[PDB]
Amino acid sequence: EPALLELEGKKWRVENQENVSNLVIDDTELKQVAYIYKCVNTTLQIKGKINSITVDNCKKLGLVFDDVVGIVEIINSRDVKVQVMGKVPTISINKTDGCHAYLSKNSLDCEIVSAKSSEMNVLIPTEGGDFNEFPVPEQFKTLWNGQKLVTTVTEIA
Amino acid sequence: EPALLELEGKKWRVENQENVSNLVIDDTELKQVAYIYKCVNTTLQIKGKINSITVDNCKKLGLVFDDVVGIVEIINSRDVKVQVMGKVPTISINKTDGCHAYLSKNSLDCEIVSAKSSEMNVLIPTEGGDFNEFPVPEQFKTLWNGQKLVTTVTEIA
Amino acid sequence: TTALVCDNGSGLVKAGFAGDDAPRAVFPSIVGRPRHQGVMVGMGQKDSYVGDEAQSKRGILTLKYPIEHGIITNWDDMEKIWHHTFYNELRVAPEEHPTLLTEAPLNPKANREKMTQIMFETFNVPAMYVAIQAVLSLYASGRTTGIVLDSGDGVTHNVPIYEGYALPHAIMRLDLAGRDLTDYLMKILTERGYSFVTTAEREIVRDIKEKLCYVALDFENEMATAASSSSLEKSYELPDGQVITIGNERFRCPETLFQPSFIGMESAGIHETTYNSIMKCDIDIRKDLYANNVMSGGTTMYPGIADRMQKEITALAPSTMKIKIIAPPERKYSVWIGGSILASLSTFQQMWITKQEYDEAGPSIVHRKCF
Amino acid sequence: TTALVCDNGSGLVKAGFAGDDAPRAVFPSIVGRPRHQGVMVGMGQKDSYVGDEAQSKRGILTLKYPIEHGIITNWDDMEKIWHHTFYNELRVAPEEHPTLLTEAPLNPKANREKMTQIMFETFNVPAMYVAIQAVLSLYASGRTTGIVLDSGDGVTHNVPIYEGYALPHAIMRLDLAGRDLTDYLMKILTERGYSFVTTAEREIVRDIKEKLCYVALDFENEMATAASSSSLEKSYELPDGQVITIGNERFRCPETLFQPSFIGMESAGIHETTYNSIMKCDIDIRKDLYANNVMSGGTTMYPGIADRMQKEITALAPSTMKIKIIAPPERKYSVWIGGSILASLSTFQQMWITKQEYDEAGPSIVHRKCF
Ligand SMILES: Nc1ncnc2c1ncn2[C@@H]1O[C@H](COP(=O)(O)OP(=O)(O)O)[C@@H](O)[C@H]1O
Ligand SMILES: Nc1ncnc2c1ncn2[C@@H]1O[C@H](COP(=O)(O)OP(=O)(O)O)[C@@H](O)[C@H]1O
Ligand SMILES: [Mg+2]
Ligand SMILES: [Mg+2]
C-alpha cells in the first residue's frame, strides 16, 4: 500500500517497495545504516562502505552491497538473495526461509550466523565464471553426556 | 470449536482439546501411535509402550508418557512440557517455541533433535527430589574453511 | 483420475503413473545453468536445462545437484527438475493429476512443508502426498516392519521401520553409493592400462559396473582364485568395437560397500552399519528387523550382495538369531513401485491432501495428513 | 508519565525510574521453586519465591537461575522475576508505566520478540523498549563508539560498538566474572586457615572482595612486596566482631581476570580478549576503539583495574597507538544509568513501541522499532 526510499537521520528507509529491479543507494557514509522493510520482489544495491544492513519481513528480495563494518541481518523474510562485492564480517539469517549468501573473494572469512532458518546456501566464487553452492545445516543433535548437554551439527556432507 | 479423543485405526486422535488437566490414554499397544493436534492448555498422559507421538500446533501443552519405541515429535507448537517416565530414544523439537523435555533416569541417552525452535530446556533428574535445567542452543556459526562449510554450536556454557 | 508418482532421487528422478509396473521417466536430477558472476540478483530468471541435456553440456554450464545427498537443498533448482518432469518428460498437465512425492530419511519438517507449498502454489495440483523413501520400499515387499538398506547414487541409508513409522535415532547415513563405485571402478581400471576420463567414458564404466561387477562371498578366496587362474576374468565390448578384459576389478568395486577403506573412507561397511542400526533399536523389535532386511535402489542390484550380507550379519548377530536378507529383483525402482501401489489403492483417495484442504491449513497440513 | 528502566542481569536485576540517579531495586535474579519429581505438568502453577528470599531458602528449594549467562533461558522463571520487580520491589502497576528492558550481547531475535510479548500480553504495559546492555553503558559515557568491557556477576563481554551498532563478530564472551572471583577468594582464604562455606559466609567473602581486593599494576612486583613486608596486608572485621588479616589474597583474586589459569581456565585474559576483539574489527575503526575503552558493571569496580588495562593494552597494541581506558565511578550501574537517561529524553517518546503498535505487528515489531 505505501511506498518510500529515503535517508531518515542516519538510516536508509527502504520500505514497502513492490516489483523494482533497478534500486541503487549511491551516496553513502561509514556512519549510516540500512533498514529494508516489507519489500516484495525488488532488487537493491548499496554502493560504498556502511555500518550495517537489516532486511525485515521481505519476500523474494535481492540485496547486493559493497562493504560492511558491522553485520548484515536477514530477519522474518523468505527467498532472499544477499551478495558481498567486498568485505562483510557477519551475515545473520534469522527466522527466514530461503537465503542465498553470495560471498566475495575477500568475504571468505565471513561468519554466517543462523537461527530458526531453512534453505540457506553459501555461494563461494571460483575462477570459472560462476560460484559453487554449499548448504547450511538446519537440524541439530543434543545429548546428555553426564555433566552437560553436547550439541552437534547434523551434517549434509 | 470441535473436540475429540478416540482410537482411529491404530492412531490416537487427541484433537481440539481446550483446558483439561486429567487426560489419560490407558489401553495401549506397541503397534499404536499418538497424534495430539490443536490442544490448548491441556495435560495428557499415555500409559504403556507405544510406537510414536506427535504434537502438532499445540498451545501450552503438557505430555507425560511411559515408553516409546520410535520418536516423540513436537511440531509448530508453543509452551510444551514433555516428560518420559521410562525410555525414549529421540525427542524432536521442530518450529516450536518453549519446550521443556523432562527426561527419566533411563532416557539419559535420549537424543534431542532441534530445528527452527527456541526456549528449549532439557531437564535431567537428580536424587534430590527435583531436576536440574539445561538450555538447548538455538543460534549457529558457519564458516568457509577453504574446502567446506564448518558449522559450530554457539554455546550457552 | 491418473495420479503421478515422483521419486526425487540423489542421482536420478523416477516419475510416471500410479499403477504402472515401472517409472515412465528416469533422468539425472541435475539442473544446468549458464555461467554468471556479477550482480547475482534475479530480475526475471533466464534459460535453464535439466537432466541428460544438462549433464552433456557439463563443460559450458554451471551444474546444480539439488538432491546430491538425498535432501533437497535448493527449491528454484527443484522447481526446474519438477517442471521438466511434468511438461517435458511425462508430457502431462500437473493441474489435472494428484501427485505423490518421495522424501529422504531425516528430512526436515520445513522441507516437507515446502514440497507441499511448491506442489500447490507453483504447479496448481488438485491434490498431493509426501511419503518416506525407505517406507515405500518396505511397503513394496508387503511389509510394514524391517530394516531397509537403500543404496542409491549419492547416499546409502539404513532405515529401521516399526509398523510403518521410522525409528530416526537408528537411521544410518553413509555418503558412499553408486557414483562412488563407478568412480572407484574408473580408478582401478587405470591399473590394467585402460583410461576412462571423459564424461562419455564414465558412461562405459557405469555400464561395466552394472553388467560385470559382482559381490564376492569371501573377498580373499576370490582374490586368490583371481590370482591363480583367469577363471573369474571376463570380456567387455566398447562402443568403437574394441574388447577389454577385466579381472579382479569385478569384485573389488562393490567390495568398497563392505570395505570403505578402498576409497579412503573411515566409515564402517554396509554390513556393520546394518547390525549397528538394529542394535540401536529397542530389544523388543530387534528379532523382526533381523528377519525382515529389505534391500533397495540401484547400488543393491549387484549379484552376490544378499549372500554376503547374510554371511556378515550371521557373523555379528548372536548364534541363535534368524537373519533373512530380502532382495526383490524390482529393488532398483522399489521406492517408486511402492508409491505406485499406494497412489493406486482405492482406500487412499481419503489420504491425499487436496488444494481445498491446503487453502485452509497451508503447508503445515503435511504433518497431520502425511503421518 | 514515570517510565521504568529494568536491567535484567546475570546475577542481579536493577530496576527503578527513568530519571533517577541510580536503580531503586537491586536484587538477585534467582527464582526459587518447591521441590517436585512426579508428573511434571502444570495444572495451575503453585507458590514461588524471587530474589534474596529465594537465595536464603537455598537448601529447601530448587533454585532457578534464568539469566545465568546473560541470555534468558526460561520465560516462566523470567515472568516471576519481572512480576516481583513490578509489584513487590518497585511497588508499581506495570499497566501505567512504559518499560525499558536491557538485553544481553548476541541475543536471539526470538529472545527480543518474547520480551516484547511478555511485556504487552503478560504485564499489560502501555509501551516498552529493548536496548542492548553494552550500548547503554557506552551511551552513559556520552559515546556511541567504543569497546565496552562489561564484567558482571556470571559473564564478561567485550563488545565493540560503531555509531551505536554492535559489531557481533568481534563480541567476546568470557564465562568468568563476579561469582568466580568470590569463589576463588573463598578457595585462597582457606590457605590462611579461614573457612567460609555457608551461604551466609559467602556474603562476607563477597564483602571482603568488594572492599579490600585491588588489581596489581605488576603482579610479580606485588607478590615480592607481599613476601618481603606485611605493608600490603590489611585487616577485616567479621559480623561476630573477630578480625582477620588478609595478605596477598587482595590482588590474587582479581588477577584471575587477567590470568584465568588461576581457576583452571584455558581462556585468555580480559586484556587479551579486549585486544583480540579490536583486532577482529575493521582497520578503519580500530583507532576509535583503542581511544574509547569503556569499563562497566560490578566486576570492573576493582582499584587499579584501569591502570593495569592501560599497561597490558599498550604492550600488545603498536607502539604508536593511543589507548584510553575509561572507568566511570558509576560503572557498577552504568547500563541502568544509560537506560535511565534514554527513557528520560523528550526525543525518545517517539522511540517507544506502544500497545496500539503491538496490537497490529505483534512481537516482530521489536526488530524495526528497536534498531
Ligand atoms: N544393475 C545395476 N547394478 C549395480 N548398480 C546399479 C545397477 N543399476 C543401477 N545401479 C547404480 O545405482 C545408481 C542408481 O540408483 P538409485 O536407487 O536410482 O539412486 P537414487 O534414488 O539415489 O537417485 C547409479 O549410480 C547406477 O549406476
Ligand atoms: N565494589 C565492587 N568491587 C568489586 N566487585 C564488585 C563490586 N560491587 C559489585 N561487585 C561484584 O560484581 C558483581 C555484580 O556485577 P553486575 O554488573 O551487577 O552484574 P550483572 O549485570 O551480570 O548481574 C557481583 O559478583 C559483585 O560481588
Ligand atoms: Mg532413492
Ligand atoms: Mg549486566
Author numbering:
A (entry chain B), B (entry chain B): 317 to 473
C (entry chain A), D (entry chain A): 5 to 375
The authors write:
CAPs are multi-domain, multifunctional proteins that oligomerize into hexamers and promote rapid actin filament turnover in vitro and in cells. The C-terminal half of CAPs harbors two proline-rich regions, PP1 and PP2, which bind to profilin and SH3 domain proteins, respectively, and a Wiscott Aldrich Syndrome protein homology 2 (WH2) domain, which binds to both ADP-actin and ATP-actin monomers. The CARP domain of CAPs binds specifically to ADP-G-actin, and together with the adjacent WH2 domain catalyzes nucleotide exchange on actin monomers. Collectively, our study uncovers the molecular mechanism by which the WH2 and CARP domains of CAP associate with actin monomers and accelerate nucleotide exchange on ADP-actin.
